[PDB]
Design a protein around this nucleic acid. Structure first.
Ligand code: MG
Lengths: 267, 98, 178, 99
RNA sequence: ACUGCUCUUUAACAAUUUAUCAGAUCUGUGUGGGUGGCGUGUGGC
DNA sequence: GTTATCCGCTCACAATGCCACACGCGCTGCTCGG
DNA sequence: CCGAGCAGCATCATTACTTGTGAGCGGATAAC
């Protein structure tokens, strides 16, 4: 069989991805509409968001939904939350760079229950449900087999919206570059997390992430054999936007490596 | 894993129910029951006692030894704990490793 | 004016009914109805017409326990412990049990009103799960339940007819797994 | 039925006869043990009890005994011996009169 | 008997912004592939 | 009274290796099931 | 109706002479 909420979510994600892909071939219609410090929100984001919300309301007119745009639309049954990013890495889309994904996760009683991310360009569908695992178009996902820092590929995002910590981040970057093999910088935390679940990157870390972006990936990597944490092993990440994740041994090595360079602001 | 605690059958529908499977059945049964109670309005004393019973069951699974006995049915003898599969002259150490 | 509180005693795996019987019998034995108000074993009647179990099914609020309106005293205590098959007094320290709170009684009785009022078939359905159809018109087809209804009870279910998916109003009686 | 069949079928004492030799069979019927329910077990048997006690003479054989872990705990009844009306071991003697 | 008198010759468009001269593979059926765990007891050395 | 001292009691923890052979290893009124 | 499966059970007192040893703990016993 299959998990029901997962199924309705993947239907929503399919529709949204098809809409985004269809609009991707007319860059004269989607404009750059900035919201904060280089966080564009184009009209296509609004359209995809509305499509997803409509598709959901058919099957759950009572579930409270969360969205970076519409804040928090309450529902008559607010024990279960629907966190959405209709588009991740808006910048990668405006530059028409074909690497982005829509992310839909459903939390139950606070604990994340199901998650999906969908890249329409490569047509890849990372699904994950707790107690059953993670799948990539039908293949199980056990993350990277790395157990050190050598030969390891580290995906990351830069605090290009919280540039005050830049130095700090860059500091640690240098430290990391003394032990790892190579970096990756794609521009969509959801897809980076997904890659962590697929072992295509030996780990990942980031500073300054909104609570509505990792919610679709943290469960992905969790049911993908990997683990997440704050920059110190705690769990305040859900509030600090500071994530470090990967297969367990690599996470341990990274934490022991980063704990010193860390500026005590994030602690 | 399912392999290391196999359920080998017999000439008929008779299966050698290894103690591990039975202890796991007991503990998972307690867990399911307790969760179903937790969602169902949770009478306080009842959930308290059920938590105690579940603690006893997981205890027995990790070790049938302490705090009392959890002997099997139809055979007045204890069930093989996980620790049992390690200690003694029968545990993996003095039986298959060394 | 001795107010008999509400206590709970652990029954056994499959003994609860006859335990309650024997309890009332021993009450009558010692004629201590004044000390033993009522022995409560709440239950539930989930009703499905087919699918193996048919036309009814009997669940319980929670097994292994029995609820009594006893009054606290050592005499009553042994009167409940001098019965065929029970464990000790579920509660605080033994020989000094803990009566359950009145709020517990009120909530449990609201539960009983709710359950006995509406015969509610559990093993319910969730919008979004896939399921086949064992019915003549759509034998062994399979679609996804897009909406679950209880009173009408007619399973708004999207299934593939003439290419385009479409809702269907088939009743519970023909659903497959889940 | 369960109790009696469990005793006669699966008990530490019950065992299918050592039936390969008439002498083996006989000496296995009149066999005395100290193990089993109510009895001590060979691990904690104690080095003492296994010894022969001068009251054994004529009552229980001092020779026939399985060499191994259970020595003395598995004895064989003497030939002329007999069980008492209580469960003690009586031995026949000849009543010596004056001379 | 006792609410009920023409309104006037059939569906009524979405498509849209450099730009161009259009810009070899269609195979197999060679083949590995079609009762034990534990406990107890006995005896032996 | 304090403060530590030591002691009686309790509880955990060990029991040769092999072999060989033999024997045996849910149940029971709930659940289901037609 | 009645056979076949099944779900969680101290099934009261189910007791139980040592085995020998070590460690720890609650409580008697004595110094300041
Ligand atoms: Mg977003």
């Amino acid at each position: 069989a299959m998990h029901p909420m997962l199924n309705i979510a993947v239907r929503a994600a399919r529709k949204a991805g098809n809409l985004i892909a269809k609009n991707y071939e007319t860059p004269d219609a989607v404009e750059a509409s900035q919201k904060g410090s280089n966080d564009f929100v184009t009209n296509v984001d609004k359209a995809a968001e509305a499509v997803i919300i409509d598709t959901i309301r058919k099957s759950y007119p009572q579930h409270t939904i969360i969205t970076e745009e519409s804040g928090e639309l309450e529902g008559t049954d607010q024990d279960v939350q629907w966190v959405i990013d209709p588009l991740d890495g808006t910048t990668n889309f405006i530059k028409r760079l074909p690497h982005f994904a829509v992310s839909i996760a459903v939390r139950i009683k606070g604990r994340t229950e199901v998650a999906v991310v969908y890249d329409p360009m490569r047509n890849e569908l990372f699904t994950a449900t707790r107690g059953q695992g993670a799948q990539l178009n039908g293949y199980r996902l056990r993350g990277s087999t790395a157990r050190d820092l050598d030969g390891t590929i580290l995906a990351t995002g830069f605090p290009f919206k919280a540039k005050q910590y830049a130095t700090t981040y860059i500091n640690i970057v240098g430290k990391l570059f003394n032990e790892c093999a190579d970096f990756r910088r794609t521009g969509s935390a959801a897809l980076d997390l997904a890659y962590v679940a697929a072992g295509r990157v030996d780990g990942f870390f980031e500073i300054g992430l909104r609570p509505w972006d990792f919610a679709a990936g943290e469960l992905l990597v969790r049911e993908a054999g990997g683990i997440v944490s704050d920059f110190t092993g705690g769990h305040n990440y859900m509030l600090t936007g500071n994530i470090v994740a990967g297969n367990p041994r690599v996470v341990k090595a990274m934490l022991a490596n980063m704990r010193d360079e860390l500026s005590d602001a994030l602690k | 894993p399912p392999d290391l605690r196999p359920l080998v059958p017999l000439d008929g529908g008779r299966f050698a129910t290894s103690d591990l499977n039975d202890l796991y059945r007991r503990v998972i049964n307690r867990n399911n029951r307790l969760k179903r109670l937790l969602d169902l309005a949770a009478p306080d004393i009842i959930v308290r006692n059920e938590k105690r019973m579940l603690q006893e069951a997981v205890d027995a699974l990790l070790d049938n030894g302490r705090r009392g006995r959890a002997i099997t049915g139809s055979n007045k003898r204890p069930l093989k704990s996980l620790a049992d599969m390690i200690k003694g002259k029968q545990g993996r150490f003095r039986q298959n490793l060394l | 004016a001795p107010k008999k509180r509400w206590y709970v005693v652990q029954a056994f795996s499959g003994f609860e009914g006859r335990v309650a019987t024997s309890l009332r019998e021993h009450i009558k034995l010692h004629n201590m109805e004044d000390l033993f108000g009522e022995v409560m074993v709440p239950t539930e009647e989930v009703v499905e017409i087919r699918g193996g179990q048919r036309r009814k099914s009997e669940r319980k609020f929670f097994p292994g326990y029995v609820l009594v309106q006893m009054v606290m005293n050592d005499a009553s205590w042994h009167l409940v412990r001098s019965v065929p098959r029970v464990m000790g007094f579920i509660g605080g320290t033994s020989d000094r049990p803990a009566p359950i709170s009145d709020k517990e009684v009120d909530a449990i009785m609201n539960r009983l009103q709710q359950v006995g009022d509406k015969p509610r078939p559990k093993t319910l359905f969730e919008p979004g799960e896939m399921v086949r159809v064992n019915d003549g018109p759509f034998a062994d087809f399979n679609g996804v339940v897009e909406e679950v209804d209880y009173e009408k009870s007619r399973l708004k279910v999207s299934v593939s007819i003439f290419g385009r998916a479409t809702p269907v109003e088939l009743d519970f009686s023909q659903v497959e797994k889940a | 039925s369960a109790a009696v069949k469990e005793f006669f079928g699966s008990s530490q004492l019950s065992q299918f006869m050592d039936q390969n030799n008439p002498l083996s069979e006989i000496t296995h019927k009149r066999r005395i043990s100290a193990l089993g329910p109510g009895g001590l077990t060979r691990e904690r048997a104690g080095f003492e009890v296994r010894d022969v006690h001068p009251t054994h003479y004529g009552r229980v054989c001092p020779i026939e005994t399985p060499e191994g872990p259970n020595i003395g705990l598995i004895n064989s009844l003497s030939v002329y011996a007999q069980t008492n009306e209580y469960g003690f071991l009586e031995t026949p003697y000849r009543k010596v009169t004056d001379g």
